[PDB]
């Protein structure tokens, strides 16, 4: 858990009277199957599990979308952010943009059950399955459409 | 009376709005009695962005730097008025004009007022 | 100690320190500081003896740390021991030695690597050059917090002589700063200015002036954040900060502390490396009384002659603006300059080198601060890995914005690794650079005068004073924001 | 006093903190301090998980204060014919406060805050409650 700093110093900052809001609307369309991992501790039969809503719709969560936005912004600027949790807000160019961004959590109309994939690992010496290396995976199909809304 | 020692004035000066992390030309020398270029100059001096200095001819015949200020908006009959954006460049060019009169940096201009 | 056998406390404590382990990762070093704090909190007179011996041992063994990575990881945790020894010690000169031993310990090692690369190049020891490149690469990785797969290599040090304070020339004054965090946190003043006048009899040569730095640090942080977000709308906060300098350090404008019209050498500490101390504002500005010069640390003091080469160069990549005064000087101008041209000029040891380009200080990692050259940025990392560099005694004028700025963060050790600092680590004679954004017209008109009148110390002061008379007529914050950023770094012969 | 009924409608799934014993609801518990921006669980009786969720009025108050800072920034401090001072966010007995502000405060004037013994306080200081006694009281949701 992030620990806030109680010796942090106080600052007043102007930012100015000029302030605009931009709204972007669209769709995010699955061109491949996809996997947002989330395990139910009470469901043991399946090893790797997909995130669903309580009524079994597929969910594109806000947390993942923000994480991917921050990752791609650091890819654009080509400079990683090193800041730790806690203390005064980070002033790097990515954090300043992310502090203006808002994104909707989204879900699908499609609600059919996921696929189950077999997966295994091969021992390279013998050419046969390694000890213990049999497992299975839930996968969400391609073609699902999610609403997308971003604001800055 | 035409401006003495005209050899030393610049041909043109070009002032430009500065930049960091919009041009105006002048012919380098003006002669004036106590109109486009005059209004252009008046615009810059009202903007407040040119340093300047003056010479005055003392009774012994030599030009001396005047103790005076060109406030916005004596017996003497002619003035040499030197202007530059750079304070230190002005202090150099005023020396050059003192030597010329009693026997320039690129952004310096001269005005001869009569 | 619990048995009040104080002579045996002295004996065992001395025996423990004398046999201390080399590695600062060892838990011994935590226990020693806890022991000294226990003695101090019980108000035992033993605490001052033990603290000074502990500092001397710690100082002895910092010398054996092999690279900046281990230096940042493990030695950085021993700062509190220097605070304690600084409080134990009563002699002002010895206080100054304790203070100075904490400063610019990473820059010293970068300087020694730059020296090593010279010898490798002239002897074509290629495999040593690769080792030198690996250490800088791993240091760059460590400042990004990355995991290091291989143990970084170790380098023995240069001939680190202890510089006598007497080597300051007779007409100067030196001000040494120290910010004692422990004393500050306990509610004391915590800020100290140690002032050396070499013209007085030896018993009167040192003064120790102390001040409270909490509010000055707050106003610094406030200006810094407003600068990052606005930026030139921060001019009023700059004026506020410069007035706060004089509020915190009223002794700067007293002749019995700093005698009349003698030049001053600053040796800052902590966030004081970031401030324009030359612009402290009583209206009266400090630069009207004294000319100023900066060093990161006193053990870096090394006067050498200016370069003999009858050649100078101006490199420009700045096409928005016409530098009419610089481009009509006697120095030839090449534009638009690429990093290859900069690398070419840097191995000719020019008398004067001018660079006119945009610049940008990084927000996270110092090594990513850069100059904006034609088709590619040149970073501090690039400068510190140029194979062939010859700048001993050169004079360097950086027209770039933020060329003397560092990230808005506090690193684990005292350090100022700006672009100007990078050039100083290559043994440049003196560097002129900007603490924040610089105006192109002011750059033109200042550097033209400096190039014409080749005495930077006096000529920068004359330029600053000549601009101040236009400040007084209206006290415009925007004009002060344009005069203030320039400062000189280094101390030539 | 006059009462203003309010309701909050969520458009997304909201987050909720894990319930903790009263010996652990203090500044030295990282888990409790991290959860202070979420909803809460209330147990009807401490030895049973049976309960229901709720939101503190303090959290809504903090969000409203941030919103008021932004609005006053856009109006250059004007609200009707009145003008707001910078507010006051400075407490001498720090250890009273479970949380301390880490972000910077938005600025719209150089003027100092209202005196602590004044009779008349600007609207922002009324909203801060600076004018057992409340002027604007936020209940739980
Ligand atoms: Zn960041
Ligand atoms: Zn108020």
| Under 8 Å between Cβ of A138 and A114 | yes
Separation between Cα atoms, residue B86 and residue B49, nearest integer Å: 10
Q: Which of C325, C359, C439 sits opposite B86 (nearest CB)?
A: C325
Q: For residue A1, give the DSSP letter.
A: -
Separation between Cα atoms, residue C81 and residue C17, nearest integer Å: 13
Q: What are phi and psi of C80, to 5 degrees?
A: -60, -30
Q: Is there a contact between A14 and C362 if contact means CB atoms under 8 Å apart?
A: no
Q: Is there a contact between D102 and A88 if contact means CB atoms under 8 Å apart?
A: yes
Q: CB count, 10 Å around CB of D75?
A: 13
Tally the residues of chain D: 141
The residue in chain A having the minimum alpha-carbon distance to the alpha carbon of residue D89 is A10
- The H or E element containing residue A119 is strand A115-122
Q: Residues of B with CB below 8 A from C463's CB?
A: 87-88
| Under 8 Å between Cβ of C418 and C433 | yes
Separation between Cα atoms, residue C345 and residue C338, nearest integer Å: 11
Separation between Cα atoms, residue C396 and residue C228, nearest integer Å: 27
Separation between Cα atoms, residue A59 and residue A35, nearest integer Å: 10
Beta strand pairing status for C206-212 and C190-196? antiparallel
| Rounded-to-10 torsion of CA A68, A74, A77, A80 | -170
Q: Which of C437, C445, C456, C461 to mutate to test the interface with B (most CBs of B within 10 A)?
A: C445
Distance, CA C219 to ligand 2 centroid (Å)? 22
| Under 8 Å between Cβ of C470 and B48 | no
Q: CB count, 10 Å around CB of D7?
A: 5
Q: Is there a contact between D74 and A19 if contact means CB atoms under 8 Å apart?
A: yes
| Under 8 Å between Cβ of C256 and C239 | no
Q: Is there a contact between D106 and A6 if contact means CB atoms under 8 Å apart?
A: no
Would the annotation count A92 as a binding residue?
A: yes
How would you write chain D as a 3-class SS string? CCCCCCCCCCCCCCCECCCCCHHHCCCCCHHHHHHHHCEEEEECCCCCCCEEEECCHHHHHHHHHHHHHHHHHHCCCEECCEECCCCCCCCCCHHHCCCCCCCCEECCCCCCCCCCCCCCCCHHHHHCCCCCCCCCCCCCC
Q: For residue A104, give the DSSP letter.
A: -
The sign of the CA dihedral B37, B43, B47, B48 is positive
Q: Is there a contact between C226 and A82 if contact means CB atoms under 8 Å apart?
A: no
The residue in chain A having the minimum alpha-carbon distance to the alpha carbon of residue D87 is A12
The answer, yes or no, to whether C and A have at least 3 beta-carbon pairs within 8 Å is: yes
**Ion ligand 2: residue ranges with CB closer than 5 A:** D 85, 114, 122, 125
Beta strand pairing status for D78-79 and D82-83? antiparallel
Separation between Cα atoms, residue D91 and residue C350, nearest integer Å: 58
Cβ partners under 8 Å of residue C162, min gap 6: C299
Per-residue burial over C434-451, b if 16 or more Cβ lie within 10 Å, else e, is bbbbbbbbbbbbbbbbbb
Q: Is there a contact between C324 and B18 if contact means CB atoms under 8 Å apart?
A: no
Give helix C456-472 / helix B87-102 axis angle, nearest 10°.
100
Separation between Cα atoms, residue C420 and residue C488, nearest integer Å: 9
C-alpha dist (Å) from residue C442 to B20, C355, C473: 10, 15, 19
| Under 8 Å between Cβ of B78 and B57 | yes
CA atoms within 13 A on the CB side of A9: 15
The sign of the CA dihedral D32, D35, D38, D42 is negative
Q: Residues of A with CB below 8 A from D86's CB?
A: 12
Separation between Cα atoms, residue C414 and residue C296, nearest integer Å: 9
Would the annotation count A25 as a binding residue?
A: no
Residue B24, SS3 per DSSP:
strand
C-alpha dist (Å) from residue C104 to C265, C316, C418: 17, 31, 12
User: Which residues partner with D51 through β-bridges?
Assistant: D43
Residue A138, SS3 per DSSP:
strand
Angle (nearest 5°) at CA C63 between C59 and C68: 110
C-alpha of A117 from chain center: 22
Q: Which of A13, A79, A92 sits opposite C229 (nearest CB)?
A: A13
Q: Which of A14, A79, A80 sits opposite C230 (nearest CB)?
A: A14
CA atoms within 13 A on the CB side of A10: 10
Separation between Cα atoms, residue C466 and residue B86, nearest integer Å: 9
Q: CB count, 10 Å around CB of C201?
A: 6
Q: CB count, 10 Å around CB of A64?
A: 15
Strand residues in C335-428 grouped as ranges (E): 352-360, 370-372, 377-379, 395-398
Separation between Cα atoms, residue C233 and residue A14, nearest integer Å: 9
Nearest ligand, CA of residue A73? 1
Burial tier of A78 (Cβ tally within 10 Å: 0-12, 13-18, 19+): exposed
User: Which residues partner with B79 through β-bridges?
Assistant: B113
For this entry, resolution in Å reads 2.5
Angle (nearest 5°) at CA C443 between C440 and C448: 130
Q: CB count, 10 Å around CB of C19?
A: 9
The residue in chain D having the minimum alpha-carbon distance to the alpha carbon of residue A105 is D12
DSSP C262-326: --EEEE--GGGGGS-GGG-B---BGGGT--EEE-S-GGG----PPP--S--EEEEE-TT---TTG
| Under 8 Å between Cβ of C82 and C55 | yes
Per-residue burial over C211-233, b if 16 or more Cβ lie within 10 Å, else e, is bebeebbebbbbbbbbbbbeebe
Nearest ligand, CA of residue D128? 2
Separation between Cα atoms, residue C406 and residue C271, nearest integer Å: 10
Residue B82, SS3 per DSSP:
strand
The sign of the CA dihedral C125, C127, C131, C134 is positive
Q: Which of D102, D103, D108, D112 to mutate to test the interface with A (most CBs of A within 10 A)?
A: D102
Give helix C456-472 / helix C440-452 axis angle, nearest 10°.
140
Helices and strands: H and E segment counts in chain A: 2, 8
Q: Which of A6, A12, A104 sits opposite D104 (nearest CB)?
A: A12
Residue B20, SS3 per DSSP:
strand
Q: For residue C439, give the DSSP letter.
A: B
The answer, yes or no, to whether D and B have at least 3 beta-carbon pairs within 8 Å is: no
In what order do the strands lie in the sheet containing A23-29? A23-29, A145-151, A102-103
Q: Residues of A with CB below 8 A from D105's CB?
A: 10-13
Separation between Cα atoms, residue A76 and residue A59, nearest integer Å: 27
Q: What are phi and psi of C431, to 5 degrees?
A: -125, 140
C-alpha of C15 from chain center: 37
C-alpha of B53 from chain center: 7
Separation between Cα atoms, residue D53 and residue D41, nearest integer Å: 5
| Nearest alpha carbon to residue C218 among D69, A12, A84, D100 | A12
User: Which residues partner with A75 through β-bridges?
Assistant: none
Q: Which of C221, C226, C362 sits opposite A14 (nearest CB)?
A: C226
Cis peptide before C231 (omega within 30 of 0): yes
| Nearest alpha carbon to residue C367 among C432, C316, C297, C421 | C421
Q: What are phi and psi of C414, to 5 degrees?
A: -70, 125
User: How far does A84 lie from chain D, in Å, by closest CA?
Assistant: 14
Q: Residues of D with CB below 8 A from A105's CB?
A: 12-13
Give helix C92-100 / helix C79-88 axis angle, nearest 10°.
170
Helix, strand, coil percentages (3-state) for chain A, rounded to 5, are 15, 30, 55
Would the annotation count D84 as a binding residue?
A: no
Separation between Cα atoms, residue A54 and residue A52, nearest integer Å: 7
Distance, CA A107 to ligand 1 centroid (Å)? 30
DSSP C407-434: -SS--SSB----HHHHHHHTT-SEEEEE
Cβ partners under 8 Å of residue C356, min gap 6: C314, C315, C316, C317, C318, C323, C326, C399, C400, C443
Q: Which of B21, B87, B106 sits opposite C324 (nearest CB)?
A: B106
User: Which residues partner with C210 through β-bridges?
Assistant: C192
Q: How many B×C Cβ pairs under 8 Å?
A: 56
Q: What are phi and psi of A150, to 5 degrees?
A: -125, 145
| Under 8 Å between Cβ of C326 and C314 | yes
Residue B107, SS3 per DSSP:
coil
Cβ partners under 8 Å of residue C158, min gap 6: C111, C112, C115
Separation between Cα atoms, residue C476 and residue C483, nearest integer Å: 11
Nearest ligand, CA of residue A80? 1
| Under 8 Å between Cβ of C77 and C58 | no
D107 near A CB under 8 A: yes
DSSP C117-140: HHHHHHTT-HHHHHHHHHHHHHHH
DSSP C143-202: HTTPPPSSPPP-------PPPPGGGS-TT-EEEEEEE-HHHHHTTS-EEEEEEE-TTS-G
Chain A interface residues facing chain C, Cβ-Cβ under 8 Å? Answer: 9-16, 79-83, 91-93
User: How far does A25 lie from chain C, in Å, by closest CA?
Assistant: 28
C-alpha dist (Å) from residue C349 to A13, C373, D13, D49: 45, 20, 65, 77
- The H or E element containing residue C18 is helix C6-18
Separation between Cα atoms, residue C217 and residue C228, nearest integer Å: 17
Separation between Cα atoms, residue A138 and residue A117, nearest integer Å: 7
Chain C interface residues facing chain B, Cβ-Cβ under 8 Å? Answer: 231, 320-322, 324-325, 328, 358-360, 401-402, 437-442, 445, 448-449, 462-463, 466-467, 469-470
């Amino acid at each position: 858990h992030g620990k806030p700093d109680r010796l942090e110093k106080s600052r007043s900052v102007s930012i100015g009277s000029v302030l605009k809001e931009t709204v972007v609307c669209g769709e995010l369309v699955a061109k491949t199957p996809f996997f947002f991992g989330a395990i139910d501790e009470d469901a043991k039969q399946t090893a790797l599990q997909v995130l669903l809503t309580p009524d079994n719709k597929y969910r594109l969560p806000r947390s993942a979308v923000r994480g991917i936005l921050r990752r791609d912004l650091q890819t654009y600027f080509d400079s990683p952010c090193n800041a730790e949790l806690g203390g005064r807000p980070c002033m790097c160019k990515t954090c300043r943009i992310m502090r203006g961004i808002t994104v909707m959590d989204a879900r699908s109309e499609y609600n059919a059950p996921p696929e189950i994939r077999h997966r295994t690992r091969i021992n390279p010496f013998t050419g046969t399955v390694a000890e213990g290396a049999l497992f299975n995976m839930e996968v969400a199909p391609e073609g699902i459409v999610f609403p997308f809304q971003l604001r800055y | 009376i035409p401006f003495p020692v005209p050899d030393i004035a610049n041909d043109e000066v070009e002032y430009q709005k500065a930049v960091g992390g919009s041009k105006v030309k002048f012919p380098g020398l003006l002669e004036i009695q106590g109109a486009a270029n005059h209004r252009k100059l008046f615009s810059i001096l009202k903007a407040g962005k040119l340093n300047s200095a003056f010479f005055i001819q003392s009774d012994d015949g030599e030009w001396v730097e005047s103790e005076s200020k060109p406030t916005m908006e004596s017996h003497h009959s002619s003035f040499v008025w030197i202007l530059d954006t750079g304070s230190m460049q002005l202090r150099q060019s005023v020396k050059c004009v003192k030597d010329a009169l009693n026997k320039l940096k690129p952004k310096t201009m001269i005005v001869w007022v009569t | 100690f619990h048995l009040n056998q104080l002579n045996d406390v002295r004996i065992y404590g001395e025996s423990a320190i004398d046999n201390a382990p080399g590695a600062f990762a060892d838990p011994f070093w935590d226990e020693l500081v806890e022991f000294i704090r226990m003695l101090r909190n019980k108000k035992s007179e033993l605490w001052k003896e033990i603290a000074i011996k502990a500092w001397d041992k710690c100082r002895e063994k910092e010398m054996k740390v092999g690279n900046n990575i281990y230096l940042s990881w493990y030695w950085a945790r021993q700062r509190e021991l220097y605070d304690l020894a600084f409080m134990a010690q009563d002699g002002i000169e010895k206080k100054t030695r304790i203070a100075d031993s904490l400063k610019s310990r990473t820059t010293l090692r970068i300087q020694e690597l730059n020296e090593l690369r010279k010898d490798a190049h002239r002897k074509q020891n290629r495999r040593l050059e690769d080792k030198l490149d690996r250490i800088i690469e791993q240091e760059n990785e460590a400042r990004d917090g990355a995991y290091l797969r291989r143990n970084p290599p170790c380098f023995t040090g240069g001939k680190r002589e202890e510089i006598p304070f007497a080597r300051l020339p007779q007409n100067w004054i030196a001000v040494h700063f120290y910010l004692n965090e422990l004393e500050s946190h306990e509610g004391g003043k915590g800020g100290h200015a140690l002032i050396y006048d070499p013209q007085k009899a030896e018993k009167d040569q040192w003064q120790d002036k102390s001040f409270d730095y909490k509010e000055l640090h707050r106003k610094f942080l406030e200006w810094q954040e407003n600068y990052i977000l606005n930026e030139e709308g921060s001019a009023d906060f700059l004026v506020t900060l410069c007035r706060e300098i004089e509020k915190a350090m009223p002794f700067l404008f007293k002749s019995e502390v700093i005698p009349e019209d003698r030049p001053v050498l600053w040796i800052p500490h902590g966030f004081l490396h970031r401030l324009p101390l030359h612009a402290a504002m009583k209206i009266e500005i400090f630069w009207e009384r004294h000319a100023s010069r900066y060093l990161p640390a006193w053990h870096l003091f090394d006067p050498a002659p200016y370069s003999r080469e009858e050649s100078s160069t101006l490199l420009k990549n700045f096409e928005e603006y016409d530098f009419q005064n610089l481009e009509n000087g006697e120095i030839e101008v090449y534009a638009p300059s690429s990093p290859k041209k900069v690398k070419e000029a840097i191995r000719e040891n020019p008398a004067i080198l001018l660079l006119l380009c945009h610049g940008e200080a990084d927000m996270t990692n110092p090594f990513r601060s850069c100059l904006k050259l034609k088709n590619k940025d040149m970073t501090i990392f690039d400068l510190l890995t140029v194979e062939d560099v010859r700048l001993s005694g050169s004079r360097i004028l950086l027209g770039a914005c933020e060329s003397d700025m560092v990230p808005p963060l506090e690193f684990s050790v005292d350090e100022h690794l700006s672009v100007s600092g990078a050039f100083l680590s290559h043994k440049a004679g003196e560097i002129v650079a900007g603490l924040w954004t610089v105006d192109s017209e002011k750059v033109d008109e200042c550097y033209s005068y400096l190039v014409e009148e080749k005495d930077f110390l006096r000529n920068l002061q004359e330029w600053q004073m000549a601009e101040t008379e236009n400040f007084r007529s209206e006290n415009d914050s925007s004009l002060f924001y344009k005069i203030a950023p320039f400062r000189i770094i280094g101390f030539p012969a | 006093t006059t009462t203003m009924k309010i309701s909050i409608e969520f458009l997304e799934p909201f987050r909720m903190t894990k319930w903790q014993e009263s010996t652990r609801r203090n500044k030295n518990n990282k888990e409790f301090v991290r959860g202070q921006a979420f909803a809460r669980w209330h147990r009807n009786k401490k030895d049973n998980t049976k309960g229901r969720p709720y939101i503190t009025g303090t959290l809504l108050r903090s969000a409203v204060i941030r919103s008021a800072e932004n609005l006053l920034t856009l109006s250059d401090g004007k609200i009707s014919e009145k003008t707001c001072c910078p507010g006051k966010f400075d407490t001498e007995d720090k250890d009273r406060l479970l949380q301390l502000r880490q972000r910077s405060t938005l600025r719209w004037t150089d003027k100092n805050p209202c005196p602590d013994n004044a009779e008349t306080y600007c609207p922002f200081c009324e909203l801060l409650g600076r004018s057992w006694r409340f002027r604007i009281h936020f209940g739980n949701l």
